[PDB]
Amino acid sequence: ATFEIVNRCSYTVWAAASKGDAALDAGGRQLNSGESWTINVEPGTNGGKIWARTDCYFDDSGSGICKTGDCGGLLRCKRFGRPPTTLAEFSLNQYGKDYIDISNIKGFNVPMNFSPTTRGCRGVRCAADIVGQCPAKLKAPGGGCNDACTVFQTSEYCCTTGKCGPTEYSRFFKRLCPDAFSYVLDKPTTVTCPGSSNYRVTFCPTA
């Protein structure tokens, strides 16, 4: 499957693409404002994620740091990024279907549109100003809005027992982005696409 990753932000982001134990394609790249990066994701890829990283410094070897979504100091992510990270999440060719979503479960750094570029389903978007509205206790100093699980490390926020409810904090994410997961047991906003759909992830779709 092809993913076009477009940075419509006025600021540089460092795109990342990982399935948690491995890079997707190159796994990361600098996107200046307006730049597009096309990656190939193996069919059957399960638990793929795409995210943006902000305020990165990388040396000549691809080692450094981001203020959001840092994946162990690498330009080319092999691992998932450090919250806060707005997540494009996908499982491809799962019994003839693709499953896509946006998640705020790991917080929010950069607004995002996650849309198919092929026919047969709709995109999802989380483009509200979650950083601007972020409750005081979830504000990440580096930039972004942490989920409550990252900040407080409770069973209720992290849903550790597999039993938990919405929270004041999950409802803030859900109110600003109803089409994204706000907590682990949120009513699914997963979209079902045809197997082997192609996609565009757009950072700062509107701004």
UniProtKB/Swiss-Prot annotation:
Annotated compartments: Cytoplasmic vesicle
Keywords associated with the record: Cytoplasmic vesicle, Disulfide bond, Signal, Taste-modifying protein
Cysteine disulfide links: C9-C204, C56-C66, C71-C77, C121-C193, C126-C177, C134-C145, C149-C158, C159-C164
GO CC terms of this entry: cytoplasmic vesicle
InterPro entries reported in the protein's UniProt record: Osmotin/thaumatin-like_sf, Thaumatin, Thaumatin_CS
Coiled coil: none
Assigned protein family: Belongs to the thaumatin family.
Protein's recorded name: Thaumatin I
